[PDB]
Amino acid sequence: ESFAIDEFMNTTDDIWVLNTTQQNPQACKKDKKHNITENGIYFFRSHKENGQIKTQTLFGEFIHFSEEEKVNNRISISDESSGVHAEHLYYSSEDKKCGLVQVFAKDQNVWTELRVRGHPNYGSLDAGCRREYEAYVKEIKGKKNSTSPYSDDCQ
């Protein structure tokens, strides 16, 4: 099954990074969708350094490794501040409120982010998303560094 990244991000809600296997990730990481076209998605990527919010306008272009691919499950990003050049959504819940994104950066760092619509709460995360992220972090070859970039002090 393929999971469309333009449907998962087609919301006016903030998409927060709940969990990530990136080592030493930024704080209060989130995306805000600005526009979705047939060629890609314009959004605003933010994080918090020492109380201040840094934001950048990004355009993720839908890319396909063949001509038979039409599901928009992968985006290429240019001029990303952390060197992230590609993102691939490999799982998302049916209500599109949580997803697992494999992130490829230019420094050859590859990690996984568990993203959620709206700010993370202490309730019950979708069981499918949870078991999928558990399976991934269990499948990491040595030293799984899973942290949460979100805090209740993030606005």
Author numbering: 48 to 59, 59a, 60 to 152, 156 to 172, 174 to 191, 191a, 191b, 192 to 203
The study reports:
In this study, we identify a family of complement inhibitors from the hard tick Rhipicephalus pulchellus, hereafter termed CirpA (Complement inhibitor from R. pulchellus of the alternative pathway). Functional and structural characterisation reveals that members of the CirpA family directly bind to properdin, inhibiting its ability to promote complement activation, and leading to potent inhibition of the complement response in a species specific manner. Whilst many molecules act to control inappropriate activation, Properdin is the only known positive regulator of the human complement system. All CirpA structures share a lipocalin fold with a short N-terminal α-helix followed by an eight-stranded beta-barrel and a longer C-terminal α-helix.
Using this strategy, we were able to purify CirpA1, A3, A4, and A5 and determine their structure using X-ray crystallography to a resolution of 2.0, 2.1, 1.8, and 1.9 Å respectively. Overall, the structures appear very similar, with the biggest conformational differences in the tilt angle of the C-terminal helix H2 as well as variations in loops between beta strands 4 and 5 (L4-5) and between strands 7 and 8 (L7-8). We identified three regions with high conformational variability between homologs. All these regions are part of the observed binding interface between CirpA1 and properdin, and hence the conformational differences might render other homologs incompatible with binding human properdin. Another CirpA1 residue undergoing a conformational rearrangement upon properdin binding is Y122 which forms a hydrophobic pocket around properdin P377 together with CirpA1 residues F122, Y131, and F150. This pocket is incomplete in all three CirpA1 homolog structures. However, it is likely that the homologues have evolved to target properdin from other species, especially given the identification of multiple CirpA homologues in a single tick species.
